[PDB]
Amino acid sequence: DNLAVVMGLHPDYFTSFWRLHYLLLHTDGPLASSWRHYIAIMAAARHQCSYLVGSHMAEFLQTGGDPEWLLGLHRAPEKLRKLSEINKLLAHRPWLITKEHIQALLKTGEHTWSLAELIQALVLLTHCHSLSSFVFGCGILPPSEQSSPDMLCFVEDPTFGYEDFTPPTFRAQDYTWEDHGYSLIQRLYPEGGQLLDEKFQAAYSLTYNTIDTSVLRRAIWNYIHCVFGIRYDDYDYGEVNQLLERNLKVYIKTVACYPEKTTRRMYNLFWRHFRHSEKVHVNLLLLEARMQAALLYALRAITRYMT
Amino acid sequence: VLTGRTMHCHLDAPANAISVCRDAAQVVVAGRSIFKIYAIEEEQFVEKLNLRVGRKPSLNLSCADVVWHQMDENLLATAATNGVVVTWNLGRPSRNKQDQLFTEHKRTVNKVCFHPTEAHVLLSGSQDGFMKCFDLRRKDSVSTFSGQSESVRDVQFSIRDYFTFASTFENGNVQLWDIRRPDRCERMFTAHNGPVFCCDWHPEDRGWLATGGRDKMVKVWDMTTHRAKEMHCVQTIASVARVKWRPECRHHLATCSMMVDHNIYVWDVRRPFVPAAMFEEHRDVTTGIAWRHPHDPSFLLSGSKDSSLCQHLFRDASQPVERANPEGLCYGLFGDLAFAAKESLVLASSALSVFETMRWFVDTAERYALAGRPLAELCDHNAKVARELGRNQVAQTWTMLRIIYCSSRLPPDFFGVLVRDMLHFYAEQGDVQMAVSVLIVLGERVRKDIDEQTQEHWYTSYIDLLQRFRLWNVSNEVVKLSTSRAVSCLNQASTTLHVNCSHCKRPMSSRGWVCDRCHRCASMCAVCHHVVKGLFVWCQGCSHGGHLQHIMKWLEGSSHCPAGCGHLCEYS
Amino acid sequence: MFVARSIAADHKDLIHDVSFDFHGRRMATCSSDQSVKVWDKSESGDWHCTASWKTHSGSVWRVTWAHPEFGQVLASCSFDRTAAVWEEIVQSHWVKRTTLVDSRTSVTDVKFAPKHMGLMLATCSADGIVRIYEAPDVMNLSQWSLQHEISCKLSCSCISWNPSSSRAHSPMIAVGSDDSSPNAMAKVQIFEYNENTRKYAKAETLMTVTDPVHDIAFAPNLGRSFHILAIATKDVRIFTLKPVRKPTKFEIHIVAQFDNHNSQVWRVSWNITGTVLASSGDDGCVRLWKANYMDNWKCTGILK
Ligand SMILES: [Zn+2]
DSSP: OHHHHHHTTOHHHHHHHHHHHHHHHTSOOSSOHHHHHHHHHHHHTTTTOHHHHHHHHHHHHHTTOOGGGGSOSTTSOHHHHTTHHHHHHHHHOGGGOOHHHHHHHTOSSSSOOOHHHHHHHHHHHHHHHHHHHHHHHTTBOOOBSSOOOOOOOOOSOTTOOOOSOOOOOOOGGGSOTTTTHHHHHHHHSSSTTHHHHHHHHHHHHOOOOOOOTHHHHHHHHHHHHHHHTOOOSSOOTHHHHTTSOGGGTTTHHHHTTOTTOOOHHHHHOSSTTOOSSHHHHHHHHHHHHHHHHHHHHHHHHHHHHTO | OOOOOOOOOBOSSOEEEOOBOTTSOEEOOEESSOBEEEEEOSSOEEEEEESOOSOOOSGGGOOSEEEEOSSSSSEEEEEOTTSOEEEEETTOSSSOOEEEEEOOOSSOEEEEEOOSSOSSOEEEEESSSBOEEEOSSSSOOOOOOBOSSSOEEEEEEOSSOTTEEEEEESSSEEEEEESSOOSSOSEEEEOOSSOEEEEEEOSSSSSOEEEEETTSEEEEEEOSSSSOEEEEEEEOSSOEEEEEEOSSOTTOEEEEESSSOOOEEEEOSSSOSSOSEEEOOOSSOEEEEEESOTTOTTBEEEEESSSBEEOOBSSSOOOSSTTSOOOEEEOOTTSEEEEEEETTTOOOOEEEEEEEOOHHHHHHHHHOOOSSSOHHHHHHHHHHHHHHHTOHHHHHHHHHHHHHHOOOOSOTTTTHHHHHHHHHHHHTTTOHHHHHHHHHHHTHHHHTTSOHHHHHHHHHHHHHHHHHTTOHHHHHHHHHTOSOTTTSOSSSSSOOOOOBOSSSOOBOOSSOSBOTTTOSBOSBOSSSOSBOOSOBOOOTTTOOOOBHHHHHHHHHHOOSOTTSOOOOSSOO | OOOEEEEOOOOSSOEEEEEEOSSSSEEEEEESSSOEEEEEEOSSSOEEEEEEEOOOSSOEEEEEEOOGGGOSEEEEEETTSOEEEEEEEOOOEEEEEEEOOOOSSOOOOEEEOOTTSOSEEEEOOTTSEEEEEEOSSSSOSSOOEEEEEEEOSSOOOEEEEOOOOSTTSOOEEEEEOOOOOSSOOOOEEEEEEETTTTEEEEEEEOTTOOSOOOOEEEOOOTTOSSOEEEEESSSEEEEEEEEOOOOOOEEEEEEEEEOTTSSOEEEEEEOSSSSOEEEEETTSOEEEEEOOSSSOOEEEEEEO
16 A cells, blocks of 8 residues: 555554564454454544554455445444544543443443453444554655555544643553553453564654754653643653744644644645655654553553542 | 452543552552542541642653652652652642652653662663752762663563663563663563563572563563573463552462453463453453452452442452363264363363264165165065164064055055054164155055155154264265255256367367367376277376276376376376 | 273473363463473373473463364463463464453453353453453454453352253353451352342352362253252262252252262263262272262262
């Protein structure tokens, strides 16, 4: 596909991303392939990105799916309909997530889920959300207008988007992907843990050269984790300002929340005579930083319920 | 000595650090929103001082590690997640024990230790891979040896050799430094895959270090030699944190988990697959464990995140070894009994044997006859077979049935109500062979006298029994001519192969041997070169085949595909 | 008189279960060192090990086979609070398929449903939850769904299905407790499936059993109209669950009570056809029992 060429700017990240995609969408697991494609379409339809939904409709149809399910969402199994509000929360406001949703999800009945399928569903939802963010923040034509060398609705409550600043906040040093979050996934999802970890270390390996490297990426990481709300414990936010600039902050705080609005002029002036690879690296680190906080919120929600 | 029993103390906030004094009477439970010091009495435990008395809602004093120092009775030091280290002196005269503060650390500090003899030394571990040492001289507060590795997670000083110390890192390499020569390390070996969260030196021996990591491993290393080696490996069910040796017993380890598991285990090291004790009272992950005195193993103090401080005792454990099931039994189709039991009833291993303790079933199934002869001949043949096998009570039933059916006179239905009970008699003992056999032999005469569900039950049970012995011929002979319609339809579903030509690609319709379009003889043998009208054999790789017997004969002496092809359609 | 031929398992810790598959020619042994071994029969007449690997991160308690129709499939429960399903792929390649991770405390028993209603699996839990799984697509062994869950308000330590294959016995399950509570609460319970409410419901409770239960086993039917249950609490016991003509109501009766062991009885088994019953106590001997057409059970062999 076209997105592969743009993503292949560096080789230390494409292999990890391809591995995670192959595990999530094609390797056998607790959910059928058609169900996986359907939840991928549902997740991607939240930012109204048509590249992924188009690429996924054909895959759903070619894998024994039911054409009757694509005439809307009311004609889907009630088990998959119970995921709508959790998807809604994970998309744009993940701070307001708690135990009520997960208990309703694992509530006994006929459409009752199991704890070995919910984890894969959550990982797929977060992956599709962040992929849509990348696609609309590095615009790809169905080949990017950014640089140089029908759809129906499928949504519950489309008039819900990203709210303001945050409220009890989050002290990220009391819950880290290292000590314990990785431990919980390694037990629920034995193979999908090390692939995420490899992807995160790869996203941390890339460093910029335009002028001490690490501080630049730290600013991006902390800024996005704050606009979602993960407040750290070793940072002075007065140092966040004179690392980025408004020409490089409206872009970031527009793609992270509502990437459906990013036009040619929205990028046209990023900064200076950039090498066009550092900008791709910046648009890439956002993928990991945005898929990290939501996963941490979901893992906290999981762990409160089994304690 | 010491005295006391199991206890509780419900706290105000979650806690993740504990330390004990030299008097073996004080606990210094700390954490994120609490810093108290406790005094434990034989009945209850009462708070003695609240160190957060000059309260200020600031991050200046959090806690991730507290270390009590045994040279005096006031020297205490805490590690904050703000990167600053705050030491305390309980001898200060106002209501504030703070003595000296340190801010020579980049990001955060994780573990703080002292050194047993000298009182002016204080180590510190960081997140920047920058371990540092301090002194009592205020100006002199720098010795910043670094290891080019990731975050430091635990530092500990040796017991006997009071010049060196250990340290553990995030990638999984354990190091060894010496205060006199802080330039280069003395050793570095890759202990785990993943971070190592804890370490503890052996009280007794000269150099014996135990590390626990996220990989659910506990390893004990011998560092006496030039190169280290691993002797024991205890496998736990979750990530390991805060491993501590027990006192006066040189082969026991007390390890707590960092997620999922709420319990606390003591292991025997010699036996690594099963613990020795199981403390299960906490309702969340425990965070700190410390043995009260290093010369009297009875008591362990262990706080947790559930806002609880506990002082459980060894005697009142929940041992899993004495609550196990030592044996296992199973039968077999041939009357073979497998019995396994540990060698304390016939203690860390078990021995098993197979006891070679229904032959008539097979011969009765083979030799019986069910169709193709008149009723009298069938009954006579079955009676002769039953007699020759050794069972006469079975043999005479066949002859009686023949007399009953194959003869004014007696009423016609006289034996109906009577033959109807022999079926139930033979069925209610597990011998469904007879019931099914006589049902098949008689058929329409007796069919409308046994309930349909009972007939299905007998048919299915007999069929399963026959299939267990790999008697497929008899198993299908029962299905083909069984009385019940729902039973005599089992080899009638998905047993028709769809076959098409490999030249014109179209499906071979009807019942013939010539393609509609290609006009060729598709079903041509590879060896016969004749036309195959009956059984055709196929190869999934070669896509070749022909008559069954010819291909059998060819594959007995050859090893290649008969059609030239070249692909050996039997891998050796 | 059986001949006790011993084989060297070479397990590094205890052995907790042995199971024959469907044909009597392969067995599987689970140990307490996170290993499962498979032994096949030779024409010479001896068992040799053909497969061994590391299954769990705890102590494997049970291993059970499935029907050959669904393939060569194994299941195991462990102290690491999980349950797994393995398949043999053609040399000896045993591959992991799923990891049933819903439990919270531990899993004590695991049993496959009789192979006339699908590929269904029931697992117990020390907290007192019995869960029933299912695989709608018989051939993908990676897609398992949770259909029902039963809370019995007591510690669970054993499980056993009803092998009766007739269309007159709604499927039912039996669970055994191991709680050493001071009160004499019943420690064996029976649940049965109701066709119209799509839900498992309590059928009857064995009130006479007020002692800890270590094993529960049904007897194969093969044409009988009633059911037989064997319990090994502290002496071998055999019950009868004849129903009433049309949940359902059973009239429970006591048929055997054998204190011959003078110890605690651990595990029991049934022969192939519900005629002979085995037992295993702390004395280290197996014992066989049988009926005598007066329903007068009596011993029929002692094996050391
Ligand atoms: Zn071939």
